[PDB]
């Protein structure tokens, strides 16, 4: 019975590893977007003010 419960625990941990791998790939993609958003805000909104 302990051997069966340990197999179910192994499967739950395996599902969580898959969720974490997918989450870290998404987070890496989101950091890249946030870098481009900050640069674009500086170019479109801040840099024009000295001429006015």
């Amino acid at each position: 019975q302990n051997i069966q419960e340990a197999c179910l625990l192994l499967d739950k941990k395996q599902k969580h590893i898959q969720i974490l791998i997918k989450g870290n790939s998404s987070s890496k993609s989101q950091i890249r977007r946030s870098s481009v958003e900050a640069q674009k805000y500086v170019q479109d909104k801040l840099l024009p003010w000295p001429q006015e």
Binding site: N2, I3, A6, C7, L9, L10, K13, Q14, H16, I17, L20, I21, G23, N24, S27, K28, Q30, I31, S34, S35, E37, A38, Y41, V42, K45, L46
Partner: protein, 49 residues
């Protein structure tokens, strides 16, 4: 039969420990990404002020 179940239990405990090691590494990587992401949000707020 006794000798086989002790062997299976030892094998499962080793596999469970190795899964926790993989989880802990992925969570450390996740913690570093969320720090970087907060850095960009704070920078964008200073730019708006």
């Amino acid at each position: 039969v006794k000798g086989d179940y002790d062997l299976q239990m030892a094998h499962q405990t080793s596999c469970s420990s190795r899964q926790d090691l993989v989880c802990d590494h992925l969570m450390k990587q996740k913690a570093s990404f969320e720090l970087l992401q907060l850095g960009y949000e704070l920078e964008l707020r200073k730019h708006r002020d």
